[PDB]
Tab-separated table of C-alpha atoms in Angstrom:
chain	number	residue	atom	x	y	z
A	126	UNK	CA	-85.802	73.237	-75.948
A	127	UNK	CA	-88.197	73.572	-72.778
A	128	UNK	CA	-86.957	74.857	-70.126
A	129	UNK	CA	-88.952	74.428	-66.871
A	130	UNK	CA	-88.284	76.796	-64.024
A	131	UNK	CA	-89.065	74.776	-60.579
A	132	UNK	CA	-89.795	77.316	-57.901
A	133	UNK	CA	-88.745	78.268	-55.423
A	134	UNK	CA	-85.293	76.993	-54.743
A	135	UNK	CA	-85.542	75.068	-51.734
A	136	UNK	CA	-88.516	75.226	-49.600
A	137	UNK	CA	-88.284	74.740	-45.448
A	138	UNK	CA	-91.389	73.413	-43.522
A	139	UNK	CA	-92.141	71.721	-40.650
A	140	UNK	CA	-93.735	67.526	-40.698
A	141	UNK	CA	-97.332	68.057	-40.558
A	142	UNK	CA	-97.441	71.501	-43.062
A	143	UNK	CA	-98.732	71.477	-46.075
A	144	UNK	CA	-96.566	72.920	-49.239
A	145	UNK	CA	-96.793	72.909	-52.587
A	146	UNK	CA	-94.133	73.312	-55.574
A	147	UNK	CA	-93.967	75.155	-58.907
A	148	UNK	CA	-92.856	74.371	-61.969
A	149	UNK	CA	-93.150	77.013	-64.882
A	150	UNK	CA	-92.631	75.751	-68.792
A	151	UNK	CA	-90.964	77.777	-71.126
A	152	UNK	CA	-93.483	76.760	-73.576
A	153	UNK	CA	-97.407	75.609	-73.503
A	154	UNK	CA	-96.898	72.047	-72.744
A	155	UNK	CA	-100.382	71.108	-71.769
A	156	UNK	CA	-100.922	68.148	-69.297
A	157	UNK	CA	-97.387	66.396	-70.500
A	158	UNK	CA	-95.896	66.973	-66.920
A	159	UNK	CA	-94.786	64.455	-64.359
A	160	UNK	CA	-93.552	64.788	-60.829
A	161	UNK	CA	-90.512	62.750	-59.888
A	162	UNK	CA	-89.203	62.800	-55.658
A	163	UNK	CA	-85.412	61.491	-55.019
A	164	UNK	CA	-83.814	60.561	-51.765
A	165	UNK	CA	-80.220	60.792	-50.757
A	166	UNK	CA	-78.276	58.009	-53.065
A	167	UNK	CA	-81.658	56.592	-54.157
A	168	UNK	CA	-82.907	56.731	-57.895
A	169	UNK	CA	-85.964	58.882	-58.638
A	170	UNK	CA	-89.418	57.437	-57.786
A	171	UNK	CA	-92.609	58.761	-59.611
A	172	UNK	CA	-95.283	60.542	-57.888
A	173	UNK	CA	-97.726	61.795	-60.622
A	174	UNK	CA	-98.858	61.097	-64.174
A	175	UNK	CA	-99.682	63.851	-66.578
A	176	UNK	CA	-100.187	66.647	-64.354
A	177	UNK	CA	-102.267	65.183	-61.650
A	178	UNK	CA	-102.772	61.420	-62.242
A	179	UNK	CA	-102.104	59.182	-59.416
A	180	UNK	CA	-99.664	56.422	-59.274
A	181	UNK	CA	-100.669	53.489	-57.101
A	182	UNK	CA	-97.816	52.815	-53.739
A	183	UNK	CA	-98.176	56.758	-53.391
A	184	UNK	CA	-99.496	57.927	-50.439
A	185	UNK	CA	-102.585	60.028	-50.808
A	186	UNK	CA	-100.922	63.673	-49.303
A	187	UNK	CA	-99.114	63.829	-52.593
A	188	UNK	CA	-101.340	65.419	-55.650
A	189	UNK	CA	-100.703	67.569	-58.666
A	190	UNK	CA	-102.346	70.303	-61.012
A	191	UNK	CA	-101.898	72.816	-63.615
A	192	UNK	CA	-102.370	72.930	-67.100
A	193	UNK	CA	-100.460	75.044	-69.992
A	194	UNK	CA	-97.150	76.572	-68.781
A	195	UNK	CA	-97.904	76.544	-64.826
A	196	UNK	CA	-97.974	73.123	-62.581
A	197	UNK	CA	-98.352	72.459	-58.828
A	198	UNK	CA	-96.998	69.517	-56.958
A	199	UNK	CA	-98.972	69.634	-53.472
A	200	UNK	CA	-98.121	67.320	-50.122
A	201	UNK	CA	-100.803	68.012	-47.807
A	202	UNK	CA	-99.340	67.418	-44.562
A	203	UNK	CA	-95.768	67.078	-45.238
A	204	UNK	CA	-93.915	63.303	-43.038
A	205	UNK	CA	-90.316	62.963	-42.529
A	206	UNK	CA	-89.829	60.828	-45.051
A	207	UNK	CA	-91.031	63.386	-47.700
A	208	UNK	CA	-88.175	65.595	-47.612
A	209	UNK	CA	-85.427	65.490	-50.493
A	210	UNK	CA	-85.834	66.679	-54.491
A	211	UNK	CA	-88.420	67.006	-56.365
A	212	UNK	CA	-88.438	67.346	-60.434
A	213	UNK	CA	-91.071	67.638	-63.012
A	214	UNK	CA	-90.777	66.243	-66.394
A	215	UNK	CA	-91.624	67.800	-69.999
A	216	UNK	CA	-92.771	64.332	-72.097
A	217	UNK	CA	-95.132	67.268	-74.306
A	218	UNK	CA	-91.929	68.367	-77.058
A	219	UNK	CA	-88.502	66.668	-77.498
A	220	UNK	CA	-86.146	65.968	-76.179
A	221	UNK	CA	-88.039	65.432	-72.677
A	222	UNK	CA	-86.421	67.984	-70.052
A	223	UNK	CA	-86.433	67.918	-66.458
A	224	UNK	CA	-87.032	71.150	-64.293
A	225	UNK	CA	-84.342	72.479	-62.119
A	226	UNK	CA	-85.967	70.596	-59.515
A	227	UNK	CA	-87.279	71.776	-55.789
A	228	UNK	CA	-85.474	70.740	-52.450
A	229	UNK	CA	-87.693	69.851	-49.699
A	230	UNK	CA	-85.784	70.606	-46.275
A	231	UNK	CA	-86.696	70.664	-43.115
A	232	UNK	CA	-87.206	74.113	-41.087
A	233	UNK	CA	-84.882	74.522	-37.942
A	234	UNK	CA	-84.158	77.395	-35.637
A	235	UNK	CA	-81.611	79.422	-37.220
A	236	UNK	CA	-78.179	78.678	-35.881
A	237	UNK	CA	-75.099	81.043	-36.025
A	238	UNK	CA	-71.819	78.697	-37.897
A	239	UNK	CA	-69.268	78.380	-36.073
A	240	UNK	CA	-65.640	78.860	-37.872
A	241	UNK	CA	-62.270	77.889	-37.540
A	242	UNK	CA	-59.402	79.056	-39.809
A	243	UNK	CA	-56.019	76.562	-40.270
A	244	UNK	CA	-52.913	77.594	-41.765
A	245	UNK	CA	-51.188	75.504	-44.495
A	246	UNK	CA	-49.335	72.345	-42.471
A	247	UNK	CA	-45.651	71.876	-42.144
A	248	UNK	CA	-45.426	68.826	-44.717
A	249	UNK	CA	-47.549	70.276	-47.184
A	250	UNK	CA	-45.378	73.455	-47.059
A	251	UNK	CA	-42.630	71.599	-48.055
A	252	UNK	CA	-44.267	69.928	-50.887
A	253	UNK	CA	-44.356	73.640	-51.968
A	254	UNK	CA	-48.313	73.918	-51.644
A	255	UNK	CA	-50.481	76.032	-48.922
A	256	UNK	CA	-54.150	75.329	-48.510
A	257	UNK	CA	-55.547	77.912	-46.015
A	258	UNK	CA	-58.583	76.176	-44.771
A	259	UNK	CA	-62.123	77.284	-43.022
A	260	UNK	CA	-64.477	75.624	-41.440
A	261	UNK	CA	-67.999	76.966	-41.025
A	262	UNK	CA	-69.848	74.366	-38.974
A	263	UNK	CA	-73.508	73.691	-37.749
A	264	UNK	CA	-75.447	76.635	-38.845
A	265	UNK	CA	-78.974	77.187	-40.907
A	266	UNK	CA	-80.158	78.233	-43.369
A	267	UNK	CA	-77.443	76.730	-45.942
A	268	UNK	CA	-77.395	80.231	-47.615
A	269	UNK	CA	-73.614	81.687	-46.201
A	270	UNK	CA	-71.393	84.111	-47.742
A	271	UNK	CA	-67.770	83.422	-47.415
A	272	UNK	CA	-64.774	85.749	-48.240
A	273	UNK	CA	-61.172	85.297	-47.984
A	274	UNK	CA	-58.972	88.505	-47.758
A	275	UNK	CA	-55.050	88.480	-47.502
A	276	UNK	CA	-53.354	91.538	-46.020
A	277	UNK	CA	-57.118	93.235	-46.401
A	278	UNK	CA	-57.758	92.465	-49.927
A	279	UNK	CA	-60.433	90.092	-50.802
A	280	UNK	CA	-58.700	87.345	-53.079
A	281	UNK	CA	-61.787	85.200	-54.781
A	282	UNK	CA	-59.089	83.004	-57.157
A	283	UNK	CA	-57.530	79.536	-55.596
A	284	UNK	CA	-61.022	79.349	-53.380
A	285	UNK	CA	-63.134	75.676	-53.253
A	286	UNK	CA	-66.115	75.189	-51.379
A	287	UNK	CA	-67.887	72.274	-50.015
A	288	UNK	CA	-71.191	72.170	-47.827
A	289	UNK	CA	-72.212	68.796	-46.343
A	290	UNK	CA	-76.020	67.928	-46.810
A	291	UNK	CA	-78.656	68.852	-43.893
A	292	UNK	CA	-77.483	66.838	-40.516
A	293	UNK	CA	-80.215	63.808	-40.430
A	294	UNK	CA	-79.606	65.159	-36.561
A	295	UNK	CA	-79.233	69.028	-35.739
A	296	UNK	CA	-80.795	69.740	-39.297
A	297	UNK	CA	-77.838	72.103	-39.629
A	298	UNK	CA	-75.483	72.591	-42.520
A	299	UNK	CA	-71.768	72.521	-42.182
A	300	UNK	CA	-69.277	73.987	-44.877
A	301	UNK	CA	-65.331	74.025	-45.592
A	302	UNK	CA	-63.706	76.737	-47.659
A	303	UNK	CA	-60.379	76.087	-48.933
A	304	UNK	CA	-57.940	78.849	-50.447
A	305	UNK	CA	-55.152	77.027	-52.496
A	306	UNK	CA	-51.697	78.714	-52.953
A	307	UNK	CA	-48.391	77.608	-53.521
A	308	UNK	CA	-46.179	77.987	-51.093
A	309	UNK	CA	-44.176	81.013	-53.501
A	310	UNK	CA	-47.283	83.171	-52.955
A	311	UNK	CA	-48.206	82.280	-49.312
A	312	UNK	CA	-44.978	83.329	-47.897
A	313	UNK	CA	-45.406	86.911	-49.775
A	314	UNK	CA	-47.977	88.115	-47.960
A	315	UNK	CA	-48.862	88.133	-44.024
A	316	UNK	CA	-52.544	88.496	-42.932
A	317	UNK	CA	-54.768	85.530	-44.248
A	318	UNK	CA	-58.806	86.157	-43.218
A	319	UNK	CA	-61.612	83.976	-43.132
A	320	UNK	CA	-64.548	85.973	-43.104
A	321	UNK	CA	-68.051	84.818	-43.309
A	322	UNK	CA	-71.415	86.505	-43.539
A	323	UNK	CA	-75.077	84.429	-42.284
A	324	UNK	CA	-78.495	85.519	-41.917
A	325	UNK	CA	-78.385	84.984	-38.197
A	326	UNK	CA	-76.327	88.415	-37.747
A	327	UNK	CA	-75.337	91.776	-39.560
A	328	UNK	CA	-71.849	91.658	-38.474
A	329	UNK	CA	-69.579	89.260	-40.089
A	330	UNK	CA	-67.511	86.444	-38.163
A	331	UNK	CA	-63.663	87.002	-38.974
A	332	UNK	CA	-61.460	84.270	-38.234
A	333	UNK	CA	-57.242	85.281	-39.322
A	334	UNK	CA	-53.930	85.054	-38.626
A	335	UNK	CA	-50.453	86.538	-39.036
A	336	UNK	CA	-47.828	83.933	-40.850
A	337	UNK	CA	-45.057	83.009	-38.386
A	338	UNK	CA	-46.218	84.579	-36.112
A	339	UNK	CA	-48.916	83.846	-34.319
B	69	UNK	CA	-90.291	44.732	-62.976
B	70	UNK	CA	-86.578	44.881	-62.152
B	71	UNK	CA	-83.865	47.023	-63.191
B	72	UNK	CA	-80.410	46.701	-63.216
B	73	UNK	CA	-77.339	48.913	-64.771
B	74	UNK	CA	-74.113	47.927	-65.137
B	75	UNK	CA	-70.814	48.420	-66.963
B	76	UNK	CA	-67.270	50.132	-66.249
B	77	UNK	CA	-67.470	53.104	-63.208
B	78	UNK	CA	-64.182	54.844	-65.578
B	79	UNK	CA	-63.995	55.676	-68.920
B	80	UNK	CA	-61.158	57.332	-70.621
B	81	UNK	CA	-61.693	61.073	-72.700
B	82	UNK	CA	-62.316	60.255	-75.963
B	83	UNK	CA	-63.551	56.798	-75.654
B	84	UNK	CA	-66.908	54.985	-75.621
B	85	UNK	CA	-69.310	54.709	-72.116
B	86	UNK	CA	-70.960	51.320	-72.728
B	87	UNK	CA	-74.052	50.683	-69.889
B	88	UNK	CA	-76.178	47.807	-69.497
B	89	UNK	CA	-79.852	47.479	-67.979
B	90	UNK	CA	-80.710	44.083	-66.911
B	91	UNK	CA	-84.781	43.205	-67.125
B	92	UNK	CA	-86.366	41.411	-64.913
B	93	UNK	CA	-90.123	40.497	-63.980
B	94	UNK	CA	-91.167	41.517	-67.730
B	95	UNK	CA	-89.844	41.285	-71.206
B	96	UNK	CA	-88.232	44.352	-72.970
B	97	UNK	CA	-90.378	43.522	-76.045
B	98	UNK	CA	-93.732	44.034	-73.770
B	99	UNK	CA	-92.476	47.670	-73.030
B	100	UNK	CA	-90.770	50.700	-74.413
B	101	UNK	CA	-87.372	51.854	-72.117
B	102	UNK	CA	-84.768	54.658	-71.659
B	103	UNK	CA	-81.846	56.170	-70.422
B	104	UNK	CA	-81.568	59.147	-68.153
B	105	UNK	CA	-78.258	60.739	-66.594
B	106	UNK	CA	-78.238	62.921	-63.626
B	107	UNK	CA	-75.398	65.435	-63.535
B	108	UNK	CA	-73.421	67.170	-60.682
B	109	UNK	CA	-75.957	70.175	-59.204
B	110	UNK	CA	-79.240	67.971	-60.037
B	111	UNK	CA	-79.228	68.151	-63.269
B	112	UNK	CA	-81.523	65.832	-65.181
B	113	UNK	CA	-81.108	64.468	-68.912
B	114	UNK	CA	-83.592	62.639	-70.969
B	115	UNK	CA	-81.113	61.010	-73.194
B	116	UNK	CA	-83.346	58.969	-75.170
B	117	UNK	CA	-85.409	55.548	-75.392
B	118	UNK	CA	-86.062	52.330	-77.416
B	119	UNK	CA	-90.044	51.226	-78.081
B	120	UNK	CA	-91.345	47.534	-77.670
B	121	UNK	CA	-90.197	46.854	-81.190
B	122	UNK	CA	-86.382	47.847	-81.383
B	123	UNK	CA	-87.043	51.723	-82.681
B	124	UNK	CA	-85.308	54.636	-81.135
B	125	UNK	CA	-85.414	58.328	-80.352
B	126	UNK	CA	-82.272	60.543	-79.399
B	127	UNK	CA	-81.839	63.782	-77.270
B	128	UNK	CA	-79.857	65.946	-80.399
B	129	UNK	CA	-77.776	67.628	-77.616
B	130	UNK	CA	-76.156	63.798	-77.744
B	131	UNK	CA	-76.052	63.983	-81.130
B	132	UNK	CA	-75.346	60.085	-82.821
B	133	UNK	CA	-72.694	60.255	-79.854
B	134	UNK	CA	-75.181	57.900	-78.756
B	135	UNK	CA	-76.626	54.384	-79.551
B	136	UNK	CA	-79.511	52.478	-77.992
B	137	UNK	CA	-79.681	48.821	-78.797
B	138	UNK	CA	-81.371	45.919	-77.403
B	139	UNK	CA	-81.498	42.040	-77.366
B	140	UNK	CA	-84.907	40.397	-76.341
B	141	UNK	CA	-83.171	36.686	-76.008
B	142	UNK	CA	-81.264	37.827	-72.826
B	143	UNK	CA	-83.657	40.594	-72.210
B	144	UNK	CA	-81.164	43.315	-71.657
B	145	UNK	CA	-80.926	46.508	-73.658
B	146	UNK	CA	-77.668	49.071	-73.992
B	147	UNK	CA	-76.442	52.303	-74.004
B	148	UNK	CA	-73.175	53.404	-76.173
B	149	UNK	CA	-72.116	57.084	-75.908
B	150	UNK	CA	-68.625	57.472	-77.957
B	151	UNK	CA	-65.803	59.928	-77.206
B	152	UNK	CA	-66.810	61.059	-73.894
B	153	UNK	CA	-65.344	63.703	-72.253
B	154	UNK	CA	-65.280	64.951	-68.073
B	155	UNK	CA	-68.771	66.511	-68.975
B	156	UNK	CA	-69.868	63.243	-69.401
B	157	UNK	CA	-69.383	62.084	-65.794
B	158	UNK	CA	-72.800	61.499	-64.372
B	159	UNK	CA	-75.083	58.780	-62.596
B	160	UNK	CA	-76.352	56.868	-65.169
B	161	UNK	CA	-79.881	55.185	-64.892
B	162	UNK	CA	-82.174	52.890	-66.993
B	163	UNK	CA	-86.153	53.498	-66.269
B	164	UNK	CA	-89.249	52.098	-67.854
B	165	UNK	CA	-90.363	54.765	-70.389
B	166	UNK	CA	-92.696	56.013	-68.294
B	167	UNK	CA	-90.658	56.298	-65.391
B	168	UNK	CA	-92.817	53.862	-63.866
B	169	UNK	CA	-89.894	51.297	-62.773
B	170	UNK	CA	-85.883	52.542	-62.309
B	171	UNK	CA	-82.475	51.019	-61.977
B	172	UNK	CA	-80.825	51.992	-58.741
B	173	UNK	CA	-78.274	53.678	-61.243
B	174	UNK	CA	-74.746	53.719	-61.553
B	175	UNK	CA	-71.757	56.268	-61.558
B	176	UNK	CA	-69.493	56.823	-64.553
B	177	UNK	CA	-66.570	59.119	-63.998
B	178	UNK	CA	-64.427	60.307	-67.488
B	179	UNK	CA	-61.054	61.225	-66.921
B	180	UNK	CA	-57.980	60.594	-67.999
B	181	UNK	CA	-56.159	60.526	-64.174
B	182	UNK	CA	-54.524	57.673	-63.045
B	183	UNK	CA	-54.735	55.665	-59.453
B	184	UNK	CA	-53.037	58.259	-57.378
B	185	UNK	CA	-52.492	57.761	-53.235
B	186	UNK	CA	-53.844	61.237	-51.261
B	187	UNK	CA	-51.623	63.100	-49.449
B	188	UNK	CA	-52.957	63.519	-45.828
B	189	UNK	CA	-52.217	66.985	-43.964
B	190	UNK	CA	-52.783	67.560	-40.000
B	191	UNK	CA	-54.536	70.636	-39.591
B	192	UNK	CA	-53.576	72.251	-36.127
B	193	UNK	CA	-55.108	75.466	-34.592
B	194	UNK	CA	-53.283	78.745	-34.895
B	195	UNK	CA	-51.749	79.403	-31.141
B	196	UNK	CA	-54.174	81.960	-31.011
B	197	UNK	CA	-57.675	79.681	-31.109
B	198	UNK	CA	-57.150	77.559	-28.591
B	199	UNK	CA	-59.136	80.277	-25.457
B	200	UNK	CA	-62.409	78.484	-25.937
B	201	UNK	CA	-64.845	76.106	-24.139
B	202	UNK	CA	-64.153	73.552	-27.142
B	203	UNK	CA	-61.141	73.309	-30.167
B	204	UNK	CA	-61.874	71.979	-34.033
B	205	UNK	CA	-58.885	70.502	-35.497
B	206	UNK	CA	-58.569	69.362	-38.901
B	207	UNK	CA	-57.505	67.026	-41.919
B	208	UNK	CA	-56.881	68.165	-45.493
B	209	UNK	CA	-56.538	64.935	-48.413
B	210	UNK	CA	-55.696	66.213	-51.196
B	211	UNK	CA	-54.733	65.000	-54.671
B	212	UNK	CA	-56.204	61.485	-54.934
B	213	UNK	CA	-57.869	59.461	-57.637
B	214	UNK	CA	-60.082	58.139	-57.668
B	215	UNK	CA	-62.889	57.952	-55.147
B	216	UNK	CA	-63.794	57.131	-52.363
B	217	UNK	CA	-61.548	57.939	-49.395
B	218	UNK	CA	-62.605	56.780	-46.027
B	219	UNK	CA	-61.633	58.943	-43.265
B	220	UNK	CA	-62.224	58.268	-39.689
B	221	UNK	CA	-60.473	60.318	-36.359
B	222	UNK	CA	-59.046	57.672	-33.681
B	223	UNK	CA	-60.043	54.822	-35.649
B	224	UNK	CA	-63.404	55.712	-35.405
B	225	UNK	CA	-63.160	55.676	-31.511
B	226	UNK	CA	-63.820	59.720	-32.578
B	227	UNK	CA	-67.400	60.378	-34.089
B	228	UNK	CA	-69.418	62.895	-32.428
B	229	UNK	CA	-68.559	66.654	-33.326
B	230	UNK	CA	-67.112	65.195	-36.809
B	231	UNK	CA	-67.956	67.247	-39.875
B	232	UNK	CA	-66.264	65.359	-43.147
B	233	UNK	CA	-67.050	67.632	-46.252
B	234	UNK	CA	-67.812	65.720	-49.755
B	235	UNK	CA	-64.680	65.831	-52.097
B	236	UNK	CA	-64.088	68.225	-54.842
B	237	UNK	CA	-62.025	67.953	-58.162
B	238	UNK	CA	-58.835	70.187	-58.018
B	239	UNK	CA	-56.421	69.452	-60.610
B	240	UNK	CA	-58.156	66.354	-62.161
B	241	UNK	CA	-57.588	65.221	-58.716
B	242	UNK	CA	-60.012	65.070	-56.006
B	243	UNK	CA	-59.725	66.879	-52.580
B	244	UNK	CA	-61.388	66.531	-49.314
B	245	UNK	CA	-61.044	67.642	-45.720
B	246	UNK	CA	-62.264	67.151	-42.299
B	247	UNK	CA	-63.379	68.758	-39.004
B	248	UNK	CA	-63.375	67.278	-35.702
B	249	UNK	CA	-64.394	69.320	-32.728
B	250	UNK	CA	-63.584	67.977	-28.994
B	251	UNK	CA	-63.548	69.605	-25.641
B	252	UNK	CA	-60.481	71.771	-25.127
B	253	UNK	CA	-59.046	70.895	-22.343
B	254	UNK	CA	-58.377	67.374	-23.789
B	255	UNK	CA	-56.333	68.212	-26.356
B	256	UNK	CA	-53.075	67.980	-26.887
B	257	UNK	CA	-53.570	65.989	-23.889
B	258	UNK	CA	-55.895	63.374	-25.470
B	259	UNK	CA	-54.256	62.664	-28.864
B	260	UNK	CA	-56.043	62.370	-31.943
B	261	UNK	CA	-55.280	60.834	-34.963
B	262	UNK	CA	-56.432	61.177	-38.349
B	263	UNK	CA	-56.797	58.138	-40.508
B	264	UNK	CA	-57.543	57.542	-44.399
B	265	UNK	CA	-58.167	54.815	-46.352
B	266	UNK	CA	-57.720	54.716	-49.844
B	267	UNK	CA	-58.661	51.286	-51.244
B	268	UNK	CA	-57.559	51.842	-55.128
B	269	UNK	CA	-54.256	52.615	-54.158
B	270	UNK	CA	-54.380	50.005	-51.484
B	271	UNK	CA	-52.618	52.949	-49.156
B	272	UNK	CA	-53.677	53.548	-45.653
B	273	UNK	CA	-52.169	56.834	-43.393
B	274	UNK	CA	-52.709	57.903	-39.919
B	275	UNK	CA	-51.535	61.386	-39.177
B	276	UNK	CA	-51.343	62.426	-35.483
B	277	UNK	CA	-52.933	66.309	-35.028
């Protein structure tokens, strides 16, 4: 099948910029790609026909090229209405694929997360479980590094993340980290560490504490 | 040109995911239509279409798991997809072949859990991170099915500073957690509460911090 590689990742601008998004086929596809832009919990809304064809109800900063295995979606100067995902579509071979698609954020000053590290609660202890949970809240970029240690060993299995989407406010992100034990193993060792690594500084923010004690 | 999905939210592993797309404004027979799915992490599926006359095309990675019918007298056209499995739990939508016109699209979830109530932890600082200007407290559900949960801190009287994280699946039960951050020097003093609503299991709990 084709695969299309969208690129890059995520890009972050500021309304009034003007970006532009690739989209690489795995195969020569010709003009057979479309450009599809979807909002939070709203369905996918079509932008361009075969490569760069405009679609009437579009505004006019959106327009596409390319040809062959490379394609550019362009948005000359970018609203704040424009940001959320963007996809192009392979109609050229079958089965139709969709690239890996591009999110369109908006650029903020960076901002340092702040964290918070809770021990497993009373009642759940009883139950025989023990979540050890971290928050990491209002910081940018998204991209965050998050490691949980006990008694100085990094432990990566029982660990669930969750990142809430970009504030509609602050423009920040916000994440929890969760590390799941049963009560057996929490009560077998005695440091528990939240540690968690951002762009905004080389050294790491550490968040622990001692069980019982405290 | 109007679409509409519809059809049951749950389906059972092994069982079939029936959908239905609801025309309006045109006439399937004037028109060729599809199917697409999006999947957890953005991922898009072309899983196949139906052309003005009845014919059809499949994606093979569905492999005659799936059937596209139609019936121009009510001008509707359907989606089967037999013996689904979790991987099969996906927004579901119905679009104009061209991707001219879409559904607003509908959620499926596949699993084989049953209605359970979440169990609703208060999440307390250590003694030893409560020195600051400001203090986060917290609220752990976990082990409910299915979704949604609604979670709100005094009632709602609580908003600002509130950071509620989207719910992940744990043990074929789904998990969620909440941070609410408040001036220090009101709490304990200033009570707060959390409070979750889970409508399937027509259970409510409030759990003081």
């Amino acid at each position: 099948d084709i695969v299309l590689t969208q690129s890059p990742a995520t890009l972050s601008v500021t309304p009034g910029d003007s970006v532009s998004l690739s989209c690489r086929a795995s195969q020569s596809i010709s003009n057979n790609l479309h450009w599809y832009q979807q909002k939070s919990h709203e369905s996918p809304r079509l932008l361009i026909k075969y490569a760069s064809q405009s679609i009437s109800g579009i505004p006019s900063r959106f327009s596409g090229s390319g040809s062959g295995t490379d394609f550019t979606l362009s948005i000359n100067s970018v609203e704040t209405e424009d940001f959320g995902m963007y996809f192009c579509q392979q109609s050229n071979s079958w089965p139709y694929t969709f690239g890996g698609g591009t999110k369109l954020e908006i650029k903020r000053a960076d901002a340092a997360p702040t964290v918070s590290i809770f021990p497993p609660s009373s009642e759940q202890l009883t139950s025989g479980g023990a979540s050890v949970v971290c928050f990491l809240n209002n910081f940018y970029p998204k991209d965050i590094n998050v490691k949980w240690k006990i008694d100085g060993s990094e432990r990566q299995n029982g660990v669930l993340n969750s990142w809430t989407d970009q504030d509609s406010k602050d423009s920040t992100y916000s994440m929890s980290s969760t590390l799941t034990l049963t009560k057996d193993e929490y009560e077998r060792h005695n440091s528990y560490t939240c540690e968690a690594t951002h762009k905004t500084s080389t050294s790491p923010i550490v968040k622990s504490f001692n069980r019982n004690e405290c | 040109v109007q679409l509409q999905e519809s059809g049951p939210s749950l389906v059972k592993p092994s069982q079939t995911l029936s959908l239905t797309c609801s025309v309006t404004g045109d006439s399937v027979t004037s028109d060729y239509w599809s199917w697409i799915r999006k999947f957890p992490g953005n991922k898009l599926e072309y899983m196949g279409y139906i052309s003005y006359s009845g014919s059809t095309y499949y994606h093979p990675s569905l492999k005659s798991r799936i059937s596209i019918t139609r019936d121009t007298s009510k001008n509707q056209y359907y989606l089967q997809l037999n013996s689904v499995t979790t991987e099969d739990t996906a927004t579901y939508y119905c679009a104009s072949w061209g991707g001219d016109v879409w559904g607003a699209g509908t959620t499926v979830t596949v699993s084989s859990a049953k209605t359970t109530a979440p169990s609703v932890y208060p999440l307390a600082p250590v003694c030893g991170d409560t020195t600051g200007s400001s203090v986060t407290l917290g609220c752990l559900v976990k082990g409910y099915f299915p979704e949604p949960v609604t979670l709100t801190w005094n009632s709602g009287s609580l908003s600002s500073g509130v950071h509620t994280f989207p719910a992940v699946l744990q043990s074929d039960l789904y998990t969620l957690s909440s941070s609410v951050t408040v001036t220090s020097s009101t709490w304990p003093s200033q009570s707060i509460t959390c409070n979750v609503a889970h409508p399937a299991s027509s259970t409510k709990v409030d759990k003081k911090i």
